[PDB]
């Protein structure tokens, strides 16, 4: 029962956006199930994009019908969403979801029972940029990483390959005057462990395929 959104985190204006969703544990052409795409602009609400049945048929939202195209690959168990001729207003988080239906005169679109986790796609004429990661030394003890000058979001930050959870607090990125982002992540740790345990952050930036690990040290 899993849905995994996939695709680039950036597209330029007047360019076709392409996203994909890998479905797991259920067949993408199984009867009684429909699959669809939904989008959410930063700080805004949900907008349905379109839905595809268990057969070939697709239905779309008349507000984006001209540009939107959806396809299901029955052998790969995955969806495809195309959005041609993008603009600034297409910047959004795209979601993959499974849609139930009600069988009457027409199979009626219904409740979305399972949702994936979306992909933030930014529309911009700028190109991607990986972050310049710098360590923030500790001083009971607060230490962290500074992920500087990158584009566009998201950035994921793990500590000790996910082993360190307790005390982790990552902050919201700031959009700098330059057009690039800056993001910090810190961990509150026992000061007694500063010289005994290794503390390394794991900065991922999917738009530029960048992964930066950085050991943070005192002094």
């Amino acid at each position: 029962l899993q849905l995994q959104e996939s695709g680039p985190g950036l597209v330029k204006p007047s360019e076709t956006l392409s996203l994909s969703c890998t479905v797991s544990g259920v067949s993408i052409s199984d009867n009684s199930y429909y699959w669809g795409w939904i989008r959410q602009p930063p700080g805004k609400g949900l907008e349905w994009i379109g839905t595809i049945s268990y057969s070939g048929n697709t239905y779309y939202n008349p507000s984006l019908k001209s540009r939107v195209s959806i396809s299901g690959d029955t052998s790969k168990h995955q969806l495809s969403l195309k959005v041609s001729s993008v603009t600034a207003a297409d910047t959004a988080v795209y979601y993959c979801a499974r849609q139930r239906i009600v069988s009457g005169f027409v199979e009626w679109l219904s409740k979305f029972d399972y949702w994936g986790q979306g992909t933030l796609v930014t529309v911009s004429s700028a190109s991607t940029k990986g972050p310049s990661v710098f360590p923030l030394a500790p001083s009971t003890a607060a230490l962290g990483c500074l992920v500087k000058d990158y584009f566009p979001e998201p950035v994921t930050v793990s500590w000790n390959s996910g082993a360190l959870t307790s005390g982790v607090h990552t902050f919201p990125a700031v959009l700098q005057s330059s057009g690039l982002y800056s993001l910090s992540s810190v961990v509150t740790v026992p000061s007694s462990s500063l010289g005994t345990q290794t503390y390394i952050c794991n900065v991922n930036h999917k738009p530029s395929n960048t992964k930066v690990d950085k050991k943070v040290e005192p002094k």
Binding site: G45, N61, V102, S110, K111, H169, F171, P172
Partner: protein, 215 residues
Amino acid sequence: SVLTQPPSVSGAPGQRVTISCTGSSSNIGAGFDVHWYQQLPGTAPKLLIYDNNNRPSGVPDRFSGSKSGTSASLAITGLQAEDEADYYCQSYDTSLSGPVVFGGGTKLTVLQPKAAPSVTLFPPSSEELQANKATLVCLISDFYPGAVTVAWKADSSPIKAGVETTTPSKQSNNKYAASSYLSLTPEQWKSHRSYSCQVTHEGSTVEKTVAPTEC
């Protein structure tokens, strides 16, 4: 946006709260079922209520749905702090607007007490300084409500220049977080005795400070 929802709804814990969703003749009035979703900050929507008033396993009895006329509403009894989220209504549509329609979205704000910010200020990294750049990282989180003032002062003299400050954003605990960056050249960092980032929340100001101390 086609279905209309309250922009914002509040309530204290242990209270019963209601979130409305009223459309046209097409979306609800036509007789089509209403579905509700829950969205926690920074996460994907969860199926909360389906087919007007049914609960999927995993949803508390505290939640219930209702439909009458062109409206539908969501009822929460025994309101928890956990419930603070964004709520969305769904209905099939027969209008020019496409088959699936969502409502405007509702900011459900469960009561929180005043919370003073936790501020941590970091001096520019030595690695960063080697790059001929220098930024100070002021980090204030876990606070409520989402409103703070950031002041930067070289020694005792404040200077509003080179400042990149964020907008508060709530965390999983529904308390806000905000970060401020000060962009200097390494020589400015060195020139002054000490730099201070001070944040003013609830009439109480926290003034952390840093200075050019190599080690």
